[PDB]
C-alpha cells in the first residue's frame, strides 16, 4: 500500500507514488523527476492530475505517451495554487527536470519535500530563505559520514583531462560513456567538446535528450555514430565483453576504447583522491569507475538541514530496515544538538 511518506499531510497530495493504483483521497498526483523508481506505474492509461516541471512534462508526453490533458507543467520559483493549495517548485540539482516542492498548508504548516537532491549553498538563496520550514520529506540516499565524494567540477575536469590526452596520443581511440537513465549528460557532453565530436548514440537516447530543453543540443549529439569518436551505450555493456563487441561493430576505424562508468559511490573513495584514480585494462580497453554523484554528500546534505532548522524530518530512501532508520535519526539528533535548534 502508500507508505506515509509519499503522503502529503492536510491536502489530497501526493509525492511519486504511482505504482499502487488509485491512491484513495489523492486529488493530484506530483512527479519530482523523471527515473523510474519514481515514474513507476505512468502510461498512456493514466486519468488523475500529474504536477511537475516543464522538462518531466516533455518526458511523460513523448517517452511515456501520457495525454497531455493530464500533464500539468509548472513553472520554477513560481508561486502556483494547486486545487486551493499554494505551491512552488524549485531546483534540486538532480537530473534535468528535477525539483523539490515547497506546499504552503492552509493551517500554516510549511512542508518542503526534496525529491531526489544534491544540496548545495545555492539553496540557501532561493525562495527557501524567505520563510520557516516546519516539515522536510529528505532524500538521505547517502547519509552516512563514509559518503564522500569530489565536486561535480573536479570530477568533469578529471574526465576532459583524460580523454583528450588519450585521444591525442591515439587519434584511432574511440571514448565510450555509459548510461540508463537521464542524468550526469555533462560527463559525455564535456568530453566530446574537448574532442570536437558530437556524441553518437541510439535513436531512442537521441529522443530522450531532445526533450530535455538543454541550450545547442543540436549541435551537440547525434544518431550518426560513424561520424562519432565519443559513442553512449547502456551501462549494462560497459565490461571489456561488451566492448570488444562493439569495437567490431566500428569496422576498423578504431583500435583502443577508454571507457568511464559514472557511478554514483565507490568504497575506493574512502581513501583515493580523484587525482589518484586509475583504469581496469585489459589489452587495448581501459574502464574507469568515476564518482560523479547527483545526491547530497553526508556533509553537504548536513549542512543543508543545519542550514534550514526543520521541526521533523521524515526520510525518503533507506527506510526498509530497522538499523537503517535508527542510524539515520542518530545523525538528525547529533545535527540538531551541534546547531541548537
Ligand atoms: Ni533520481
Known amino acids: 500500500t502508500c507508505p506515509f511518506?509519499?503522503?502529503?499531510?492536510?491536502?489530497?497530495?501526493?509525492?511519486?507514488?504511482?505504482?499502487?493504483?488509485?491512491?484513495?483521497?489523492?486529488?493530484?498526483?506530483?512527479?519530482?523527476?523523471?527515473?523510474?523508481?519514481?515514474?513507476?506505474?505512468?502510461?498512456?492509461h493514466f486519468t488523475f492530475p500529474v504536477y511537475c516541471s516543464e522538462i518531466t512534462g516533455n518526458l511523460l508526453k513523448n517517452k511515456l505517451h501520457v495525454q497531455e490533458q493530464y500533464i500539468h507543467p509548472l513553472p520554477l520559483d513560481?508561486?502556483?495554487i494547486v486545487n486551493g493549495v499554494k505551491v512552488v517548485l524549485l531546483d534540486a540539482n538532480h537530473c534535468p527536470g528535477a525539483v523539490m516542492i515547497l506546499f504552503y498548508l492552509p493551517n500554516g504548516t510549511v512542508i518542503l519535500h526534496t525529491?531526489?537532491?544534491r544540496a548545495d549553498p545555492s539553496m540557501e538563496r532561493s525562495l527557501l530563505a524567505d520563510q520557516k520550514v516546519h516539515m522536510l520529506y529528505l532524500d538521505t540516499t547517502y547519509c552516512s559520514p563514509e559518503y564522500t565524494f569530489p565536486s561535480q567540477?573536479?570530477?568533469?575536469?578529471?574526465?576532459?583531462?583524460?580523454?583528450?590526452?588519450?585521444?591525442?596520443?591515439?587519434?584511432?581511440?574511440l571514448v565510450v560513456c555509459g548510461t540508463?537513465?537521464?542524468?550526469?549528460?555533462?560527463?559525455?557532453?564535456?568530453?566530446?567538446?574537448?574532442l570536437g565530436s558530437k556524441v553518437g548514440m541510439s535513436q531512442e537516447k537521441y529522443k530522450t535528450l531532445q526533450c530535455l530543453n538543454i541550450p545547442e543540443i543540436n549541435s551537440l549529439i547525434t544518431t550518426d555514430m560513424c561520424s562519432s569518436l565519443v559513442h553512449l551505450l547502456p551501462m549494462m555493456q560497459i565490461n571489456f565483453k561488451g566492448l570488444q563487441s562493439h569495437l567490431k561493430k566500428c569496422g576498423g576505424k578504431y583500435n583502443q576504447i577508454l571507457a568511464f562508468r559514472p557511478t554514483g559511490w565507490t568504497h575506493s573513495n574512502?581513501?583515493?583522491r580523484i587525482a589518484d584514480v586509475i583504469p581496469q585494462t585489459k589489452g587495448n580497453?581501459?574502464?574507469?569507475?568515476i564518482p560523479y554523484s547527483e545526491h547530497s554528500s553526508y556533509l553537504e546534505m548536513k549542512r543543508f538541514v543545519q542550514w534550514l532548522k526543520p521541526q521533523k524530518?521524515?526520510?525518503?530512501?533507506?527506510?526498509?530496515?530497522?538499523?537503517?532508520?535508527?542510524?539515520?535519526?542518530?545523525y538528525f539528533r547529533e545535527w540538531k544538538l551541534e546547531a541548537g535548534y
Not at 18 to 41: I, K, N, P
Open 78 to 80: 513560481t508561486e502556483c
Open 313 to 330: 524530518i521524515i526520510p525518503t530512501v533507506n527506510v526498509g530496515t530497522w538499523k537503517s532508520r535508527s542510524t539515520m535519526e542518530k
Open 115 to 117: 525529491g531526489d537532491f
Open 180 to 194: 540508463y537513465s537521464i542524468g550526469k549528460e555533462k560527463v559525455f557532453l564535456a568530453i566530446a567538446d574537448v
Open 153 to 173: 567540477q573536479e570530477v568533469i575536469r578529471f574526465a576532459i583531462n583524460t580523454a583528450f590526452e588519450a585521444v591525442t596520443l591515439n587519434p584511432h581511440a
Open 270 to 272: 574512502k581513501f583515493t
Open 5 to 44: 511518506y509519499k503522503k502529503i499531510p492536510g491536502t489530497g497530495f501526493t509525492v511519486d507514488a504511482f505504482q499502487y493504483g488509485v491512491v484513495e483521497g489523492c486529488t493530484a498526483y506530483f512527479l519530482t523527476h523523471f527515473h523510474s523508481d519514481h515514474y513507476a506505474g505512468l502510461s498512456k
Open 285 to 289: 580497453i581501459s574502464i574507469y569507475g
